[PDB]
């Protein structure tokens, strides 16, 4: 909004980062105890009963991170996804999260490029990546194919597959089709994958699986029973199904367990990411 705000933002961003790609990221004192609070318990009633109803994904993100403070990158660009720096228990994390309040949280070209570069930046500077998933799939329009969704959307899955930092993914609700695999799934190398009971993991949702006459009951019956976390959990694709109020403690526990993760890519001059 003004020059003072610009410089405040720069100081805030640098404060979450190491000085270089070999240095330690500063660690601060934790700001909250791990005992449950009202902000944790709020997550239990956050998911709407109605299929079509949205929620603000920042209400999940802010419940997990220290002081509820996310320093966003690209906040006004592709707001169907959220990216920013935060801390959990005094350690820096980078957050990537689908936002149901914009374009139904669908992935498109712009959100894919926004999240891809943020993940690569975090990974380069040894900042763990924390992903919150509520994704219907990809944005439908004639223009997405024409404008390059195949080669441009591929940047996001490349960035997750390339990353070697600790990574934790939490599915709060939708994880349909190609959206499930792209959004920090275990199959890309993410270390810990948690699902709320409200996770809807399936090749397709109920609206697509159909085919007093007009009725939502058969799709609602399909979403329950067929769009749950439990097939993924049976196969180990998610490590645990958690109550929503457990998210903060489970994320903090996983990041501590993963702190010393050591993984190196096969040697190369560099990669050939799609451009």
């Amino acid at each position: 909004a003004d020059e003072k705000d610009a410089f405040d933002y720069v100081r805030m961003v640098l404060g979450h980062l190491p000085s270089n790609n070999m240095g330690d990221t500063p660690v601060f004192a934790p700001t909250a105890a791990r005992e449950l609070t009202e902000a944790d318990r709020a997550l239990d009633t956050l998911i709407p009963d109605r299929t079509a109803e949205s929620y603000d994904m920042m209400r999940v993100v802010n419940a997990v991170i220290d002081d509820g403070e996310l320093t966003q990158f690209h906040q006004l660009f592709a707001p169907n996804v959220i990216c920013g720096l935060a801390r959990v228990e005094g350690h820096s994390v980078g957050v990537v999260a689908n936002q149901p309040t914009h374009l139904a949280g669908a992935l498109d070209i712009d959100a894919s490029e926004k999240a891809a570069r943020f993940i690569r930046f975090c990974d380069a500077f040894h900042v763990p990546v924390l992903t919150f998933v509520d994704v219907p799939g990809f944005l439908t329009s004639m223009e997405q194919e024409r404008d390059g969704i195949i080669r441009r959307g591929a940047k996001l899955i490349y960035a997750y597959c390339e990353a070697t930092v600790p990574m934790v993914t939490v599915i709060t609700r939708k994880a349909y089709g190609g959206g499930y695999g792209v959004m920090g799934s275990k199959h890309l190398g993410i270390d810990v994958n948690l699902a709320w009971p409200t996770a809807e993991i399936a090749v397709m949702g109920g609206e697509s699986a159909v085919r007093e006459e007009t009725r939502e009951r058969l799709v609602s019956e399909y979403t329950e029973t067929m769009c749950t976390p439990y097939v993924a959990a049976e196969r180990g694709y998610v490590d645990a199904v958690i109550m929503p109020h457990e998210t903060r403690a489970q994320v903090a526990t996983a990041l501590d367990t993963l702190r010393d993760k050591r993984m190196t890519r096969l040697p190369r001059k560099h990669g050939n990411i799609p451009l």
Binding site: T140, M142, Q144, E145, C161, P274
Partner: protein, 230 residues
């Protein structure tokens, strides 16, 4: 006397049974699936591998792999051979077997040949032609599409990676060719898109044909997702 004699032909019958299973595989070249493929102006997966590789150089992997109707090979032909005397690895989706849809065994076969190319340092060539996800396996299909991309990213800038599209390639599956180095499409008989025309019409109310949405010329001239129009 010492022990007994059997007069069995047990060992011969075992060799005859391998021959029988091999003849099942070989007869498929003239069965109805291959006929429908040729009727569409398309070569089969095995015809494609034979044409691409040096004569008599193909060695197949996992020919009798099978899910636990279950046909041998689980919808992809994998192996290795030479091109101009130089070592390469290949996988070719088989549109004539379960539509070439990606299942657990299909995925594991491609993982095996990708890993082989990476650790022996040779190029890998994929030939795509498939009706989509094996819906019956559900999230397992999604898992293996993602596992394949993970290997392509691991190999990026390590070994040359080439993708041919010679049939349909749709959904998130398109990100596997997108992460290779070179995507080749054949005019009129190949198509690629994240979102197909039926969903497009249901959402936008606009009608677009498959060729207009995702044909070879479209991706070679407009979207940039393909590098050669054959």
């Amino acid at each position: 006397m010492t022990a007994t004699e059997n007069a069995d032909g047990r060992t011969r019958r075992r060799l005859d049974e391998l021959a029988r299973r091999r003849a099942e595989l070989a007869a498929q070249a003239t069965e109805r699936g291959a006929g429908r493929q040729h009727a569409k102006g398309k070569l089969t997966a095995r015809e494609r591998i034979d044409l691409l590789l040096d004569p008599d150089s193909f060695t197949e992997l996992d020919a009798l792999a099978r899910h636990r109707q279950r046909p041998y090979g689980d919808g992809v032909v994998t192996g290795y051979g030479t091109i101009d005397g130089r070592k390469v690895c290949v996988y070719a989706q088989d549109f004539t077997v379960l539509g070439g849809s990606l299942g657990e065994v299909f995925g594991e076969k491609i993982i095996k040949v990708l890993d082989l190319a990476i650790r022996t340092g040779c190029p890998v060539i994929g030939i795509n032609d498939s009706g989509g996800a094996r819906i019956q396996e559900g999230v397992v299909s999604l898992a293996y599409y993602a596992e394949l991309v993970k290997r392509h990213v691991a190999a990026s800038g390590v070994i040359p990676q080439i993708s041919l599209i010679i049939g349909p390639c749709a959904g998130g599956a398109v990100y596997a060719p997108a992460t290779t180095d070179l995507v080749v499409m054949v005019e009129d008989i190949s198509h690629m898109f994240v979102t197909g025309p039926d969903v497009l019409q249901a959402v936008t109310g606009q009608t677009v044909g498959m060729e207009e949405l995702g044909g070879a010329h479209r991706h070679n001239a407009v979207s940039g997702a393909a590098h050669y129009m054959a």
